[PDB]
Amino acid sequence: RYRPGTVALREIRRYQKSTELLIRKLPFQRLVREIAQDFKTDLRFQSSAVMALQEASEAYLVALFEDTNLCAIHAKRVTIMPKDIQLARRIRGER
Amino acid sequence: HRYRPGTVALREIRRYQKSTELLIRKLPFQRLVREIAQDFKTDLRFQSSAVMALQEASEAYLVALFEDTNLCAIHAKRVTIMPKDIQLARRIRGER
Amino acid sequence: RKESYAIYVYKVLKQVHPDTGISSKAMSIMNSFVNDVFERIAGEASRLAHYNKRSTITSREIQTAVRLLLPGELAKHAVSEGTKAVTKYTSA
Amino acid sequence: RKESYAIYVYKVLKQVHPDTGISSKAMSIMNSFVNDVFERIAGEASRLAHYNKRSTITSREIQTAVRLLLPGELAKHAVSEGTKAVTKYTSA
Amino acid sequence: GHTIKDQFLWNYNDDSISPEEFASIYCKDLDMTSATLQTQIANIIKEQLKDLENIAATEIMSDLHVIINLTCNLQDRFFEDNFQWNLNDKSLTPERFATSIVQDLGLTREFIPLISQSLHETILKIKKDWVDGHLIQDHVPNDAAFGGSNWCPRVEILTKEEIQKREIEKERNLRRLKRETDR
Amino acid sequence: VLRDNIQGITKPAIRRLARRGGVKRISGLIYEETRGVLKVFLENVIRDAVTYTEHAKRKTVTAMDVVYALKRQGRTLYGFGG
Amino acid sequence: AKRHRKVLRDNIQGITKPAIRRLARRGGVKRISGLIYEETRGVLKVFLENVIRDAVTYTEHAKRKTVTAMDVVYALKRQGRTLYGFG
Amino acid sequence: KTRSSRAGLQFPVGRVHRLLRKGNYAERVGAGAPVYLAAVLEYLTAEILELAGNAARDNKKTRIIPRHLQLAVRNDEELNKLLGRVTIAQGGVLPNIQSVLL
Amino acid sequence: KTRSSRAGLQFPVGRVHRLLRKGNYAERVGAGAPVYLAAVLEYLTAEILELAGNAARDNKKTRIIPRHLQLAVRNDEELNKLLGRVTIAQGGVLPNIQSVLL
Amino acid sequence: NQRHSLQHQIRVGNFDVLLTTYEYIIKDKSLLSKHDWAHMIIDEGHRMKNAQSKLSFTISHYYRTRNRLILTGTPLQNNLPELWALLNFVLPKIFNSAKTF
DNA sequence: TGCCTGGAGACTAGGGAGTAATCCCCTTGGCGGTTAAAACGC
DNA sequence: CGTTTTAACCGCCAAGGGGATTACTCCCTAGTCTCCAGGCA
């Protein structure tokens, strides 16, 4: 077992260097269809629409993770907690 | 007769949050607006309504930023706002 | 002359509260709010008719606009009232 | 027929580096960026001409929209290029 | 440190206990006896009476029909329901209607003094606008020709997941609804 | 019929997202909050897209409508249209 | 000094310490550090610079030399912050 | 014969239709769009005026001031979400002291 | 003969003129405004493609991919401030190590 | 504080002549307007010039006298823009006719 | 490479924009006086 | 919190400069018709 923190750095470098997708297609598609069933039934979805939704979700989640990381760094903490995300969304003006 | 620190601060907080008075004098803010506008274009006139709207917008933005930095400081388990608190608030708001 | 929404807001207030009045500053604020909502709904309906390659702003465009801008309950009641108004305009 | 800025972006790229290619995804990205910037500038110029009670969009309106939208050096370069362009169009 | 919340119907037409003795026994039972609490109780249940004493179901003499849409909440498994209730009727008391509802469904006994009271409050509201513009238009939820695909409006289900937003929503609806009458 | 599919987004996915965002250590309670904010964001975007489709008299959601919904909430998405 | 007062107070110092203190008290801050003043002064200066630049561009597009209230209203509306009570 | 009376509204249908026409939002404008827009506008205005009147009566004031408008728009969560990005002159901020500062 | 050739730009001034006409932005449009807007767009795309080519050459690639465009947009502070709100597919922004979380 | 003490000591009017300035005429109108006056003399009449000025308006609204004396070392401004103002201040002769002169 | 429709050239005119003529009101700069607000120190 | 200081607020004086107006001109762009080559399949 390595000292905790080096595999973290390696993953940081690898994921910031790569440009691939981090969320699988089928679970996100099922979630989108389930959420869309509420507003109207018997709807259909295009592959491009689901792909754009996935890209927007990934970008928004990466931005929120950057914000909560900065918030946790401010509190002298290397770990993120739900209160950090709550503070980030409260300051952003959406909570 | 002296009071321990913190109670007069709370009284002033209540007084200012209850009232809607302007917390910045008219002439200094108008002079600052004119000085800042001198850098963009010289010999420019200003209506009183323009500088009043500028003052209102500035106070609104300042009190919003102060609420945000107060929340950020409370998140750090403190009761004192610091420059880094305001910097974090501006970085999270995106208006840096 | 100078057009404004003062008298209409005053009539609405007197129809909802016959005792409480309104000041000039509050009247100007309400007029600015009405203008803002009007321009928001107008731009929404315009871009909606543009996205469908249409050229006639109708009740459906404004309905979609208010459903997009007004969130939750503020939408629903509104469109209902809107429909009601439309129906009454079809009565006469 | 459908319109697109693909060939124009390709020509602009070939006028900077003839050896550097471009993918279809990057081409669509550039097309969407062109469309978004054009819509932004057009809306800004429209609302500027509306604030002045004007009914004609001229080079002054687009210049003001560029100076309002583009930050600093970019704005200066853009307005200079535009002036040179309109000069070359009026010369011939 | 703890707060108390409850409802009860008084029937002030008789005099056998006073608003002070009721608090004298309501706090002795809860064992939080305090002079300030007894006076606080007698300072709230008297204004409710004086404010509602002016409205009584007597001398109505008008065959009125209303779609009663009520909502009850006992901080667990709250519910809402709407049905057709005819004013100027003395055979079916709200207590019997509540006993029928608690009997048909699998509800505990504590729901009998919960749906009846909230129903009486609605009755008072139905009688409030009766002192003025209270003309009864034919307001129906369903029919066949004169005065049914499904009973989606006619629902008496119980829901554990809290939709704790009706207070503002009803006020929002009520304020617009009241202005609708004038036109 | 699809219901209770939020579990499809799993802990490794949130961990990869945090690693992309630069997070070095993640608490066990983060996943629920990320799933909730993702659910509310998707709810808003899909509601706007469904409104756009209903206005367009269509029965199929398109990428153009998703781009228009993102512009409505305020953001532009290149590489997919608009 | 008998020769001259020699006062060179800067215009940015017009917003004084009690003004920032009242602003922070209105914002809900109990205790304030001593370095907050320069930071909020810089933030206010940047915000005023942006808004004044936008308003000057707006009023120059119309060839007018007087900065009116509608120009500042439009400048604020451009940055996604609408102000009411002025037009 | 004004169309506002026919539709049953207090807002000017003709003025709204003229503003929609001369606003260059489109080349043609139907007949139901002005009455619908006027209905939405009058509903929003009535709601805001009712909330402001309630706030003023709570503050034993019979004249609505910008402070009452701010209180009414910030108390209701719906209008707060709608006008969150809009500041109001002479409205101040609602009193809200944190628990850690009391 | 095309007016773009007379002006000296590669972007079609006729297409921009038609879009401004049928776009319902005003009742009339000038003749120099389309050329001005086309020149602005051409300069913007030239800057974007130049920075993308520089980023691709730095990464030893013979083609421009969305990663190169993202890097070119996030590197330049001017375009970063301009394009701050827009998100682009094939994300990731800037590889950077934090000096406090080693 | 000294002005308030003096006003309190002489609140009943135990004085013969009260000599004050226009700043005290304006700021202290809440206390001095309660007494009636018969004759007033104002020096440096050149500052009274504007008829709609806060000084003249305050003088009109605070109290009313019968005799009014204006002292000055030089007539109104060369262009006589507010001669009718001094005329109305002195006598009710041109008040209802100045607009046509 | 082959095909065509959007783009371009020539002619007409009218209405929005440019320019001159007119004037007053809002602004700018300054000073008096008062005092509540700002500065310095423990 | 005190004590010392002093600049902000209300009141007055003067002026002139754009922001309002109205009237006349004028030429730019909106059409309408006729080619045609740059852009699309």
Cβ contact B49 with chain K strand, < 7 A: yes
A3, amino acid identity: R
Q: Are the beta carbons of I48 and I69 closer than 8 angstroms?
A: yes
Interface contact I26-H24, CB threshold 8 A: yes
Read off φ and ψ for residue C83, nearest 5 degrees.
-55, -50
Structure tokens at E129: 């606008």
Structure tokens at C38: 């009007």
Work out the angle at residue A79's Cα, subtended by the Cα atoms of residues A74 and A84, and round it to the nearest 5 degrees: 55
How distant is C1' of L34 from CA of F81, in Å? 38
Picking from A34, A40, A38, C74, the residue whose alpha carbon sits closest to that of residue F52 is: A40
Sole residue written with tokens 């300069």: I43
Cβ contact B43 with chain L strand, < 7 A: yes
Read off φ and ψ for residue H63, nearest 5 degrees.
-135, 125
Picking from E114, E96, E85, E97, the residue whose alpha carbon sits closest to that of residue E9 is: E114
Residue E72 pairs with which residues in a beta bridge?
A: E79
3-state helix, strand, coil in chain I (%, to 5): 55, 5, 35
Residue-level length of chain A:
95
Interface contact C29-G87, CB threshold 8 A: no
Classify residue B43 as exposed, middle or buried by CB count within 10 Å of its CB (0-12, 13-18, 19+). Answer: exposed
Picking from B81, F79, J9, the residue whose alpha carbon sits closest to that of residue G34 is: B81
Which residue, among C1, C2, C8, would best test binding to H if mutated, counting the most H CBs under 10 Å from its CB? C8
Sole residue written with tokens 């939408």: C75
Which DSSP symbol is given to J20? -
Which DSSP symbol is given to C18? S
Which DSSP symbol is given to B58? H
Which residue, among D41, D44, D46, D48, would best test binding to G if mutated, counting the most G CBs under 10 Å from its CB? D48
| Domains annotated on chain G, with CATH | 1-86 (1.10.20.10)
Structure tokens at C86: 């439309």
Please tell me the distance from the alpha carbon of residue F80 to that of residue I88, in angstroms, as a whole number.
9
Q: Rounded to whole angstroms, what are the CA distances from E9 to D12, D47, E48, E118?
A: 83, 63, 11, 10
C-alpha dihedral sign at A15, A21, A24, A28:
positive
Q: Is H63 strand, coil or helix? A: strand
| I98 neighbourhood in chain F, CB within 8 Å | 22
| B85 neighbourhood in chain A, CB within 8 Å | 74
Q: Are the beta carbons of D58 and I30 closer than 8 angstroms?
A: yes
Q: At what angle do helices B48-75 and A82-92 cross, to 10 degrees?
A: 180
G50 in reach of chain B (CB within 8 A): no
C16 in reach of chain E (CB within 8 A): yes
Please tell me the distance from the alpha carbon of residue C57 to that of residue I22, in angstroms, as a whole number.
16
DSSP A14-77: HHHH-----S-HHHHHHHHHHHHHHH-SS-EE-HHHHHHHHHHHHHHHHHHHHHHHHHHHHTT-
Residue-level length of chain E:
183
Residue of I nearest to H25 (CA): I24
Cβ contact I14 with chain K strand, < 7 A: yes
Read off φ and ψ for residue B47, nearest 5 degrees.
-85, 155
Interface contact G54-D68, CB threshold 8 A: yes
Closest Cα in chain G, distance from residue B44 (Å):
6
Please tell me the distance from the alpha carbon of residue D5 to that of residue D29, in angstroms, as a whole number.
11
Read off φ and ψ for residue J77, nearest 5 degrees.
-45, 140
Classify residue E68 as exposed, middle or buried by CB count within 10 Å of its CB (0-12, 13-18, 19+). Answer: middle
Work out the angle at residue J15's Cα, subtended by the Cα atoms of residues J11 and J21, and round it to the nearest 5 degrees: 80
| A83 neighbourhood in chain B, CB within 8 Å | 75
Structure tokens at E81: 């329901």
J10, amino acid identity: I
Interface contact C88-H6, CB threshold 8 A: yes
DSSP chain G: --S-------GGGGS-HHHHHHHHHHHT-SEE-TTHHHHHHHHHHHHHHHHHHHHHHHHHHTT-SEE-HHHHHHHHHHTT-EEES--
Q: At what angle do helices H13-22 and C24-51 cross, to 10 degrees?
A: 50
Picking from B37, B36, B81, B39, the residue whose alpha carbon sits closest to that of residue B62 is: B81
C10, amino acid identity: Y
Sole residue written with tokens 């388990």: B77
| Domains annotated on chain I, with CATH | 1-102 (1.10.20.10)
Residue of C nearest to E170 (CA): C73
DSSP B11-33: HHHHHHHH----SS-HHHHHHHH
Please tell me the distance from the alpha carbon of residue C32 to that of residue C22, in angstroms, as a whole number.
15
Cβ contact B19 with chain K strand, < 7 A: no
Give I11-18 contacts, CB < 8 A, sequence gap 24+.
Answer: I11/D5, I11/D8, I11/I38, I11/I39, I11/I41, I11/I42, I12/D8, I12/I38, I13/I38, I15/D3, I16/D38, I16/I41
Instruction: Locate all alpha helices (DSSP H) within chain F, ordered by sequence.
Output: 11-21, 30-55, 63-73
B54, amino acid identity: L
Please tell me the distance from the alpha carbon of residue C33 to that of residue H70, in angstroms, as a whole number.
12
Please tell me the distance from the alpha carbon of residue B93 to that of residue E121, in angstroms, as a whole number.
48
Sole residue written with tokens 């610091």: B82
Cα B46 off chain centre by: 22
Q: Is I34 strand, coil or helix? A: helix
The H or E element spanning position J69 is strand J67-70
Q: At what angle do helices A47-74 and F63-73 cross, to 10 degrees?
A: 30
Picking from E161, E82, E73, the residue whose alpha carbon sits closest to that of residue E117 is: E73
Residue of E nearest to H9 (CA): E183
Structure tokens at H9: 């509204």
How distant is C1' of K22 from CA of G65, in Å? 20
C47, amino acid identity: R
Please tell me the distance from the alpha carbon of residue B22 to that of residue G15, in angstroms, as a whole number.
12
Residue-level length of chain I:
102
Which residue, among C67, C69, C70, C76, would best test binding to F if mutated, counting the most F CBs under 10 Å from its CB? C67
Boundaries of domain holding B81: 1-96
Cα D71 off chain centre by: 14
Please tell me the distance from the alpha carbon of residue E183 to that of residue E180, in angstroms, as a whole number.
6
The H or E element spanning position F77 is strand F77-78
Please tell me the distance from the alpha carbon of residue B13 to that of residue C62, in angstroms, as a whole number.
45
Structure tokens at E95: 């207590």
How distant is C1' of K37 from CA of J17, in Å? 35
Cβ contact J61 with chain L strand, < 7 A: no
Q: Are the beta carbons of F30 and A82 closer than 8 angstroms?
A: yes
Cβ contact D91 with chain K strand, < 7 A: no
Of H8, H43, H78, nearest to E176 by CB-CB distance is: H43
Residue F26 pairs with which residues in a beta bridge?
A: A80
How distant is C1' of L25 from CA of D63, in Å? 28
- Beta carbon pairs, F and I, within 8 Å: 24
Residue J19 half-sphere exposure, CB side, CA atoms within 13 Å? 1
Sole residue written with tokens 């702003």: C57
Q: Which of residues 144-173 of E touch H (CB under 8 A)?
A: 168, 172
Of I89, I90, I95, nearest to A16 by CB-CB distance is: I95
Q: Diameter of chain A by CA atoms?
A: 53
Sole residue written with tokens 């800037």: I94
Q: Rounded to whole angstroms, what are the CA distances from G57 to A19, C62, G50, G66, G68?
A: 41, 34, 11, 12, 12
Centre a 10 Å sphere on the Cβ of residue E144 and count the other Cβ atoms it contains: 6
| E179 neighbourhood in chain C, CB within 8 Å | 15-16
C48, amino acid identity: L
Which residue, among I48, I74, I79, I88, would best test binding to F if mutated, counting the most F CBs under 10 Å from its CB? I88
SS3 letters for E137-182?
Answer: CCCCCCCCCCCCCCCCCCCCCEECCCCCCHHHHHHHHHHHHHHHHH
Read off φ and ψ for residue H2, nearest 5 degrees.
-60, 145
CATH number at residue A41: 1.10.20.10
Centre a 10 Å sphere on the Cβ of residue E141 and count the other Cβ atoms it contains: 13
Which DSSP symbol is given to I7? H
Centre a 10 Å sphere on the Cβ of residue C69 and count the other Cβ atoms it contains: 18
G67 in reach of chain B (CB within 8 A): yes
Q: Is H101 strand, coil or helix? A: helix
Q: Rounded to whole angstroms, what are the CA distances from E20 to B24, E43, E44, E53?
A: 55, 10, 11, 18
The H or E element spanning position F61 is strand F60-61
Please tell me the distance from the alpha carbon of residue I87 to that of residue E150, in angstroms, as a whole number.
46
Q: At what angle do helices I13-22 and I32-58 cross, to 10 degrees?
A: 120
Please tell me the distance from the alpha carbon of residue G54 to that of residue D67, in angstroms, as a whole number.
9
Cβ contact I29 with chain L strand, < 7 A: yes
Q: Are the beta carbons of G33 and B80 closer than 8 angstroms?
A: yes
SS3 letters for C41-73?
Answer: HHHHHHHHHHHCCCCEECHHHHHHHHHHHCCCH
How distant is C1' of L37 from CA of J36, in Å? 98
What are the domain boundaries of chain C?
A: 1-92
C7's CB contacts (< 8 A; 6+ apart) are none
D59's CB contacts (< 8 A; 6+ apart) are D82, D86, I30, I32, I33, I36
Classify residue E53 as exposed, middle or buried by CB count within 10 Å of its CB (0-12, 13-18, 19+). Answer: exposed
Q: Are the beta carbons of J49 and J72 closer than 8 angstroms?
A: no
Q: Are the beta carbons of C44 and C69 closer than 8 angstroms?
A: yes
- Beta carbon pairs, C and E, within 8 Å: 10
Please tell me the distance from the alpha carbon of residue C33 to that of residue H17, in angstroms, as a whole number.
18
Structure tokens at C92: 């006469």
- Does residue H92 come out as left (phi exceeding 0), alpha (psi in the -120 to 50 range) or beta? left
Which DSSP symbol is given to F24? S
Torsion angle (degrees, nearest 10) of CA C33, C35, C38, C44: -90
| E169 neighbourhood in chain C, CB within 8 Å | 73
Q: What does R_g of chain G's alpha carbons equal in angstroms?
A: 18
Structure tokens at F78: 């290149």
Please tell me the distance from the alpha carbon of residue D38 to that of residue F30, in angstroms, as a whole number.
41
Residue of C nearest to H37 (CA): C62
DSSP E43-84: TTHHHHHHHHTT--SSS-----EEEEEEEE--SSSEEEEEEE
Q: Are the beta carbons of J42 and J21 closer than 8 angstroms?
A: no
How distant is C1' of L22 from CA of G65, in Å? 22
Interface contact G52-B66, CB threshold 8 A: no
Sole residue written with tokens 């975007």: F45
Resolution stated for this PDB structure, in Å: 15.0
Centre a 10 Å sphere on the Cβ of residue J72 and count the other Cβ atoms it contains: 15
Q: Rounded to whole angstroms, what are the CA distances from G25 to B23, C69, G37?
A: 10, 35, 13
Work out the angle at residue F79's Cα, subtended by the Cα atoms of residues F74 and F82, and round it to the nearest 5 degrees: 50
Please tell me the distance from the alpha carbon of residue H64 to that of residue H55, in angstroms, as a whole number.
9
The H or E element spanning position B80 is strand B80-81
Q: Are the beta carbons of I89 and I74 closer than 8 angstroms?
A: no
Q: Do chains J and I touch by CB distance (3+ pairs < 8 Å)?
A: no
Please tell me the distance from the alpha carbon of residue G32 to that of residue J99, in angstroms, as a whole number.
61
Binding partners of C (≥3 Cβ pairs within 8 A): E, F, G, H
Centre a 10 Å sphere on the Cβ of residue J64 and count the other Cβ atoms it contains: 11
| G61 neighbourhood in chain D, CB within 8 Å | 48, 52, 60-61, 64
Please tell me the distance from the alpha carbon of residue H25 to that of residue B34, in angstroms, as a whole number.
38
Closest Cα in chain F, distance from residue A1 (Å):
17
Q: Are the beta carbons of G84 and C30 closer than 8 angstroms?
A: no
Please tell me the distance from the alpha carbon of residue F73 to that of residue D71, in angstroms, as a whole number.
24
How distant is C1' of K14 from CA of A30, in Å? 62
G21's CB contacts (< 8 A; 6+ apart) are G32
Nucleotide closest to residue B28 (CA–C1') = L8
Buried b (16+ CB within 10 A) or exposed e, J8-46: eeeeeeeeeeeeeebeebeebeeebeeeeeeeeebeebe
Residue A79 pairs with which residues in a beta bridge?
A: F25
Buried b (16+ CB within 10 A) or exposed e, E70-93: bbbeeeeebbbbebebebeeeeee
Name the interface residues of H facing B (CB cutoff 8 Å).
Answer: 66-67, 87, 89-98, 100-102
Sole residue written with tokens 């004493």: E53
F15's CB contacts (< 8 A; 6+ apart) are F26
Q: What does R_g of chain D's alpha carbons equal in angstroms?
A: 16
Picking from J82, B20, I9, E142, the residue whose alpha carbon sits closest to that of residue D81 is: I9
| H77 neighbourhood in chain C, CB within 8 Å | none
H83's CB contacts (< 8 A; 6+ apart) are C33, H73
Q: Which nucleotides of L are covered by protein (CB under 7 A)?
A: 1, 7-14, 17-20, 28-30, 38-41
Strand ranges inside chain H, DSSP E: 28-29, 63-64, 86-88
F76 in reach of chain D (CB within 8 A): yes
The matching CATH number, chosen from 1.20.990.10, 1.10.20.10, 1.10.10.10, 1.20.58.760, for C1-92 is 1.10.20.10
Which residue, among E167, E171, E174, E179, would best test binding to C if mutated, counting the most C CBs under 10 Å from its CB? E179
Domain total of chain B: 1
Please tell me the distance from the alpha carbon of residue B66 to that of residue G26, in angstroms, as a whole number.
8
E179's CB contacts (< 8 A; 6+ apart) are C15, C16, H46
Interface contact B14-H66, CB threshold 8 A: no
Strand ranges inside chain I, DSSP E: 28-29, 63-64, 87-88
Q: Is I88 strand, coil or helix? A: strand
C-alpha dihedral sign at D76, B46, G45, G84:
negative
